[PDB]
C-alpha cells in the first residue's frame, strides 16, 4: 500500500518529498481516522507540547487507535519530540495547503490497459513498444532471455494477470517506482506527480510511460496540458458458474476469454457468450504455471454475473472446494532441500547440535526417537564448521 511505500523511506527523502503543492495533502488523506485531527490541532502551534498530553488525550477505550496512529506518524516523522511540534517545513506547507499561499478518457484508459494485457498474454496482435516490453521484463513479471524471440510469461506473470485492475495497476506502478530508482530517475519528482494527479527530462519520460499505460492522455499532439483518466487518480460481472464445472461468460473482449482459457477448457464461443469447462487438466495447468486456487476463486467471484449474486455464497461450494482440492493435490509432496545426519554415538551431542541449529535457524526438521535431523545446505556449512570446531 501507499502507506507501506511511504513508511519505507528515510527522513532526508521524506522532508524533500513533502512538497508544497500536494504531498502534504495526499499524505494527510492517508491518515486513517484520528491523526488528521491531531495534525489540524497542532498546525498552528509554534511551541512543542509534552507527550503525556497526547497520551492522555484519548479515552481509555479505543486507546489502541491512539498508539497505532502515534506510531504511524512517528514513522512518517511529521513531528519531533524536541525534548511534539510538527516539522516546520511540513507545518508551513500544510498551512499553504489550507487557506494559504471524461467518458472518452475512461474508455481510452480501459482500451490501453486491455491492449497492454493482450501483449502481456501471448496475443499475436498487440501494441508494440520496446520500452514497455523491457520495462515489463525488468518488472519481474516477464523474462525474454532471447531478444529475437518474443518474451514469455513467468510464474508471477499469471498471478499478476489474474489480479483485479485496481490492485494490478497499483502493484505495476509500485514496481515502476522501484525500477525508476534503479534506472536513475529521481523518485521524489515522479512520486509527487502521482499525488498531484489526485487533486524536465525525467518528468517528460515519466509522463510518456504513464500515457503508454493509459492513465493520462494529452489529446493535443503531446502538449504540456494533460487530462488524467479515472485510473490516474488511483463494474458488473459477466461469468455464470454451474454446478458441473461449466462457465458461461458474456464476454466480447478477447482479454476475458484468454483469462478464462488460462484455467479452463473452452468449448463454444458465441458472439456475446462463451462456454468453457473447468477440468482437472486446465486447473492443474494453471497451478503448474504458478497460479493458486485463491486467485482463480477471487477472479470468478469478482467477475460474477448478477444472476448468481442472489444465491449465497455466490460461487457454488462444490466448485470452490473442487478447485481447492485440485490445487492441494499438486503440492501433496512438499520438497525441501536439506542434509541428513546418521550414526549419532551419543544423544547428548545430538541434542546440543539441535539446540545450536534451533538458535541459528538452520534446523528444518528433527526426530528425537530416531536421533536424526535435516539441515538446509545454507546451514550445512555452519553445522560443519561447528563439528570441525568440536
Amino acid at each position: 500500500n501507499l502507506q507501506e511505500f511511504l513508511g519505507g523511506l528515510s527522513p532526508g527523502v521524506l522532508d524533500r518529498l513533502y512538497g508544497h503543492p500536494a504531498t502534504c495533502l495526499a499524505v494527510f488523506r492517508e491518515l486513517p481516522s484520528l491523526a488528521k485531527n491531531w495534525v489540524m490541532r497542532m498546525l498552528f502551534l509554534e511551541q512543542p507540547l509534552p507527550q503525556a498530553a497526547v497520551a492522555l488525550w484519548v479515552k481509555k477505550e479505543f486507546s489502541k487507535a491512539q498508539e497505532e496512529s502515534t506510531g504511524l506518524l512517528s514513522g512518517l516523522r511529521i513531528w519531533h519530540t524536541q525534548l511534539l511540534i510538527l516539522n516546520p517545513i511540513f507545518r508551513q506547507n500544510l498551512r499553504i495547503a489550507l487557506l494559504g499561499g471524461v467518458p472518452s478518457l475512461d474508455k481510452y484508459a480501459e482500451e490501453r490497459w486491455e491492449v497492454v494485457l493482450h501483449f502481456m498474454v501471448g496475443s499475436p496482435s498487440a501494441a508494440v513498444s520496446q520500452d514497455l516490453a523491457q520495462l515489463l521484463s525488468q518488472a519481474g513479471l516477464m523474462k525474454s532471455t532471447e531478444p529475437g524471440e518474443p518474451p514469455c510469461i513467468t510464474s508471477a506473470g499469471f498471478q499478476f494477470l489474474l489480479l483485479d485492475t485496481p490492485a494490478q495497476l497499483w502493484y505495476f506502478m509500485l514496481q515502476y517506482l522501484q525500477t525508476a530508482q534503479s534506472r536513475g530517475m529521481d523518485l521524489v519528482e515522479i512520486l509527487s506527480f502521482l499525488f498531484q494527479l489526485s487533486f524536465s527530462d525525467s518528468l517528460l519520460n515519466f509522463l510518456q510511460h504513464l500515457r503508454e499505460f493509459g492513465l493520462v492522455f494529452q489529446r493535443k499532439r503531446k502538449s504540456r496540458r494533460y487530462y488524467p483518466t479515472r485510473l490516474a487518480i488511483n463494474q458488473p460481472g459477466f461469468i455464470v458458474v454451474e454446478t458441473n464445472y461449466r462457465l458461461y461468460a458474456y464476454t466480447e473482449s478477447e482479454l476475458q476469454i484468454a483469462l478464462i482459457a488460462l484455467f479452463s477448457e473452452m468449448l463454444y464461443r458465441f458472439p456475446n457468450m462463451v462456454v468453457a469447462q473447468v477440468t482437472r487438466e486446465s486447473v492443474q495447468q494453471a497451478i503448474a504455471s504458478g497460479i493458486t486456487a485463491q486467485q482463480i476463486i477471487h477472479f470468478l467471484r469478482t467477475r460474477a454475473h448478477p444472476v448468481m449474486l442472489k444465491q449465497t455464497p455466490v460461487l457454488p461450494p462444490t466448485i470452490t472446494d473442487q478447485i481447492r482440492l485440485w490445487e492441494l493435490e499438486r503440492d501433496r509432496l512438499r520438497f525441501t532441500e536439506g542434509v541428513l545426519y546418521n550414526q549419532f554415538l551419543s544423544q547428548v551431542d545430538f541434542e546440543l547440535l539441535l539446540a545450536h541449529a534451533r538458535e541459528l535457524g538452520v534446523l528444518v526438521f528433527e526426530n528425537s526417537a530416531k536421533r536424526l535431523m535435516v539441515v538446509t545446505p545454507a546451514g550445512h556449512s555452519d553445522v560443519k564448521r561447528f563439528w570441525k570446531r568440536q
Binding site: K36, N37, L43, F62, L98
Partner: protein, 263 residues
Amino acid sequence: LNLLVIVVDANPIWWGKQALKESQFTLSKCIDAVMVLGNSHLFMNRSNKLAVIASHIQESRFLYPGSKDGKYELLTSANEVIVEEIKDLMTKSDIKGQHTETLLAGSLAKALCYIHRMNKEVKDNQEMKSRILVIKAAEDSALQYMNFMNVIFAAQKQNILIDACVLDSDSGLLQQACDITGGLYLKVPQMPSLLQYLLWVFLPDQDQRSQLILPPPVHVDYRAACFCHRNLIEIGYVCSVCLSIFCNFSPICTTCETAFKIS
C-alpha cells in the same frame, strides 16, 4: 461522510458595536476562523461536504451552496464565494429600528431542510452524518422560543447534532437546544483564540467524539414559569387545551376560555 453546516450569527448591531469599541476581535476575523474551520473539515476527506449560513435581523442567507497562489481549487472557490457573498450581505442592508434582535431559528430551519435535501439526493450506499456548528454572537429574542424549540425537536427526530459555540453571552435557549440533541456546548472566553477551540472541540465528528476527551457539558436549568410573571415555578397548572404553565389555580385560564367545571 459528513455534511457540516456553519450557522454564523453575524448580527450587524453587535459586531458593529465591537467595531466602534475598536476591540481586538472583529467580524472579519470571525469569518476567517469559520472559513478555516470549513476548509479543514473538507480537508479531512473528499466525501465530506460543508455549507455556511449567515444570520441577520431581516433574513438569513447561504454563504455557500485556478491555483494563482498554488492553492487547492475547491477550497479556493470556497474562499472566494464566501468572501464575496459575506461582503455583499454586510454592505447592503436596510435599517429597521423596530426589529434589531438577531434571527437564528429561521436560519436553523433553512439548515435542517438543506440537510434533508442533501440526504435525499445523496446515494443510499453512503451514510451521511450531518452536523450544525451554530456560532452565536448576540443575545437571543424571547419571541423566538416556540419556533426554535420546534426546529430543535425536528433536528432531534432527524438525527442532527447542534454544536453550539456561543461567545460573549450564554444563551439559555441555545444551551437547552444543543442539550436535547446531544451536541457539544463550548463557551469560548478568549475570542482571539477561537479557532483553536474549533479545531479541537467542534471539528472532530460524532464518529470520534465519544472516543475523545472534550470539555464536560454545562448544567442545564430546565426552568418553568407562569405566563403571568415569567418567573421560575416548580409546580405548573396546565389545562388539556392550552398546555400552558400557569401561576395558580384559576376558575378558567385566560388563553383557553374553556368552561372548566369545579370539583
